[PDB]
């Protein structure tokens, strides 16, 4: 079902054709789906542990690590393959007038199939290595608007 590419898609360093298969072993062993806790107090979604998708850029089942900044925001666009635009809204202080002005930043973030998101949801992203030209963040937690 997940094999939608011109290539087979496998989790790196997981031997699927193992003969001594076992489910009591740790993830990635005996043909088990690999997954990890990203750390920083973030729970691993159960749909990543029980998923069948293959995403190398997934924070929980892929090869990327979360290190650096942790940024909150709102889903501003979700029209790309596994990538969403996160809009951050903040107040910029103007020194001379002692006032604030509203400013925004559009941060591209990779979203793994373990989350389904819609424009307007509150998301938490964590900094990772560069994944594309503009993406340096991975969605870590999605809070729906309602």
């Amino acid at each position: 079902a997940e094999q939608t590419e011109k290539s087979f898609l496998k989790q790196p360093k997981v031997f699927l054709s193992t003969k001594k298969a076992d489910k009591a072993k740790r993830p990635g062993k005996a043909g088990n789906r690999f997954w990890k806790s990203v750390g920083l107090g973030f729970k691993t979604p159960r749909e990543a542990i029980d998923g069948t998708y293959i995403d190398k850029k997934c924070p929980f089942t892929g090869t990327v690590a979360i290190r650096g900044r942790i940024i909150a925001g709102t889903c501003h666009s979700a029209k790309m393959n596994r990538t969403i635009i996160v809009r951050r809204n903040y107040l910029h202080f103007v020194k001379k007038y002692q006032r604030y002005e509203k400013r925004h930043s559009n941060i591209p973030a990779h979203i793994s199939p373990c989350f389904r998101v819609k424009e307007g949801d509150h998301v938490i992203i964590g900094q990772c290595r560069p994944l594309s030209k503009t993406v340096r963040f991975n969605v870590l937690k999605v809070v729906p608007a309602g």
Binding site: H92, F93, V94, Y97
Partner: protein, 140 residues
Amino acid sequence: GKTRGMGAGRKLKTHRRNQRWADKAYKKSHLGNEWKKPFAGSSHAKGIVLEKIGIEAKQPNSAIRKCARVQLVKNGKKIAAFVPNDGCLNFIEENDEVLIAGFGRKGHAVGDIPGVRFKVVKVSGVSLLALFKEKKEKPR
């Protein structure tokens, strides 16, 4: 009234930015037209005396101001430069190096002399003050 909200910093800054162009000094500084002036932003300029001329003063006064017509060397622009210090027109000759300066009002005409914002300060490398006071002589 004027905007006062804590969240109206952008409004205030943009309004000040737009209104600063009404001030004459600000717009003179930040328009870039001072680079099209004869001096092109420099305090002094050198030039060739083209011809000695006498231009009449304003209506209340009655005098011939006896300025000089100078072609600048840096850009080839012809200007009229006043020659102060009674008798100093005789130190001025055609095809003679002169150092011009501003007439003191920043391109605005000065006194009863119409259309003149430049004075001769140095001729042939010798200051006009020295020639007036006979402290130095004009080279031949």
